Design a protein around this ligand. Structure first.
Ligand SMILES: Nc1ncnc2c1ncn2[C@@H]1O[C@H](CSCC[C@H](N)C(=O)O)[C@@H](O)[C@H]1O
Ligand SMILES: Nc1ncnc2c1ncn2[C@@H]1O[C@H](CSCC[C@H](N)C(=O)O)[C@@H](O)[C@H]1O
Ligand SMILES: COc1cc(O)c2c(c1)C(=O)c1cccc(O)c1C2=O
Ligand SMILES: COc1cc(O)c2c(c1)C(=O)c1cccc(O)c1C2=O
Ligand SMILES: [Cl-]
Ligand SMILES: [Cl-]
Ligand code: NA
Lengths: 319, 319
């Protein structure tokens, strides 16, 4: 039935995890057709059992079959690359920590102590727990780095970064966005703020250990906040934007860059943000409402299409 | 994108789990339209956050939205009933035990110790582990009871059980099949063989502690083996059927009743059977092959329709 297969949606994620996490998918580079008999001899993977997984992956549209051999579909070519954001995504998606968070989601809907399903499962909020877990921190940071790399070219296209001199990326993680921007727009002052136990090192990037809930370093003419606000409540989002308004002078600009809620796209990410952070997906007008409450005004708006989501690009200045 | 949402398939299962496992779905009986504000007052569920889950459940087709109220779809009426097989399926599908089995699935494809992904995660094979885990045993046995209840009427319709005098259901679990058959077909000796520490009790039914890998007791004119062979390898399946042939005389009949592999249905259950049991789904032809190797021959075959799967009904006798 359609209902029992909907209940069993998890099996699709688990099948992809087995295929990608083992590195079996790396044998499918460059659109090659793989003979599972040959793959078994060199890799040691069970012929009969991996062939049955491949049949399920064909059903899913991950693999295509010809002459009893399997290739990756064009869409799923990314699974052959272990450095692809999709590879890091599947490693996190059904990991034990995420699974235990999802099992607390039901109970989390009845509590009002401001603890996410993740915190209920782990005893600390997501980013505080990641401080003590290499697997989660390295894979999450790697995922954010890959998606940052993918948006750079379009971001440099739609907005002229050459007009700015002092640039701070707030919650910029490993700093991939400004590292790539600094290679195209050379000779500016580039800074990245995040929570660092050990400072990253990269040519002409000033890495700052900080906390955007407490304070944003003042004196920059361009601030960037990319994919941060969806990890936070309305009240915490207003606090962050208030801290920007206090850091900014009349000539300063804040680029609020975020995946945006659109009716046509899936609500699944909105639920994941609830589970991990008590966060949420927001529309443009919802972001604008928070910014207006924080004492910021929209000067410019654009849409950036990415394969996986639409993005809101909102240029903010103090009222 | 389609691929990121395919990777995020687990979120669909986890959303349904939060909705059903909490008992929130029991407020949606008889296709009623629910005001989430009203539900929040009564149940104590967070209005805003549950409304967002309901938006995702509408996207999935689990809920239907009208006038900002939500009802279960006709197909998903079963979610309002905590005694439905779908309710028990949901409880097991993304439980910690299954999650940890799925996380070993990739690694299991590179080993030939004969340990399932489940055994690699939990240290014992499925049914041996269930002996010591009430959560898995109670919910698994409840699931099997519910799916047995749904097929009883169709079995009674397509086979004359009244022609037999002594009937043994082998691996019959809680004995629901014969409990229900005994209500319609009177004046028979009914027995159920399974792995029991303490014997179940039912007015019409004699429960026997046994092991179908070791021996099947003689002196029954009808034997039944329903939904057992998919938990076993081809070699173990032939051993089970050989033990039937040794227990049976020329006048004995064996009803082999099993979900059957048809090309038009999902391979997802085939992969679950690999993970839990190193089992598999089989076609009619594949079942007949095993029976023939065990020294049994097909007297009668029928296809039984169930909502979630087609079934093979095979009457077997000794050569
Ligand atoms: N209180 C806090 N102060 C500063 N950074 C924080 C923070 N809480 C979380 N973060 C950081 O916020 C980031 C969210 S993920 C976004 C990373 C990057 N801006 C990108 O778009 O790819 C993480 O790097 C996390 O470490
Ligand atoms: N070695 C063994 N001997 C007997 N029963 C066994 C067994 N190993 C597993 N079983 C039983 O096999 C059953 C598989 S599930 C099928 C239950 C029932 N026939 C139905 O169709 O609903 C379980 O009840 C399990 O306890
Ligand atoms: C597995 O758990 C995840 C937690 C996540 O936070 C994310 C993702 C996955 C993710 O795939 C993602 C993709 C694109 C842009 C993003 O911002 C994310 C993101 O944030
Ligand atoms: C979640 O774990 C499961 C393990 C299972 O073994 C099953 C099921 C679920 C199951 O939903 C099911 C449905 C119909 C007929 C069946 O035989 C099964 C079955 O066997
Ligand atoms: Cl600086
Ligand atoms: Cl309301
Ligand atoms: Na500061």
């Amino acid at each position: 039935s359609m209902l029992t297969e909907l209940i069993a949606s998890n099996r699709r994620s688990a099948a992809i995890h087995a295929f990608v996490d083992t590195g079996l998918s790396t044998h499918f580079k460059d659109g090659i057709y793989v003979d599972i008999s040959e793959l078994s001899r060199k890799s040691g993977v069970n012929y009969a059992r991996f062939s049955r997984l491949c049949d399920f992956l064909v059903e899913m549209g991950v693999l295509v079959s010809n002459d009893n051999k399997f290739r990756l579909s064009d869409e799923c070519h990314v699974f052959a690359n272990p450095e692809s954001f999709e590879s890091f995504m599947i490693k996190l998606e059904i990991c034990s920590h995420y699974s235990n968070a999802w099992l607390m989601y039901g109970k989390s809907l009845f509590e009002d102590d401001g603890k996410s399903a993740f915190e209920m499962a782990h005893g600390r909020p997501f980013f505080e727990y990641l401080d003590g877990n290499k697997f989660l921190k390295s894979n999450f940071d790697a995922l954010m780095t890959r998606v940052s790399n993918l948006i750079v070219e379009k971001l440099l296209g739609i907005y002229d970064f050459n007009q700015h001199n002092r640039i701070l990326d707030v919650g910029g993680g490993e700093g991939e966005l400004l590292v790539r921007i600094s290679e195209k727009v050379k000779g500016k002052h580039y800074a990245v703020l995040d929570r660092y136990s050990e400072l990253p090192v990269s040519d002409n990037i000033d890495f700052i250990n900080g906390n955007f809930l407490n304070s944003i370093p003042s004196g920059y003419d361009l601030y960037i906040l990319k994919n941060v606000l969806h990890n936070w409540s309305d009240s915490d989002s207003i606090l962050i934007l208030e801290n920007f308004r206090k850091a900014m002078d009349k000539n300063s600009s804040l680029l609020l860059i975020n995946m945006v809620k659109e009716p046509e796209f899936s609500r699944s990410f909105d639920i994941l943000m609830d589970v991990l952070f008590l966060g949420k997906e927001r529309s443009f007008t919802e972001f604008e409402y928070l910014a207006n409450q924080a004492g910021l005004v929209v000067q410019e708006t654009k849409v950036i299409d990415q394969s996986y989501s639409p993005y809101s690009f909102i240029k903010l200045q103090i009222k």
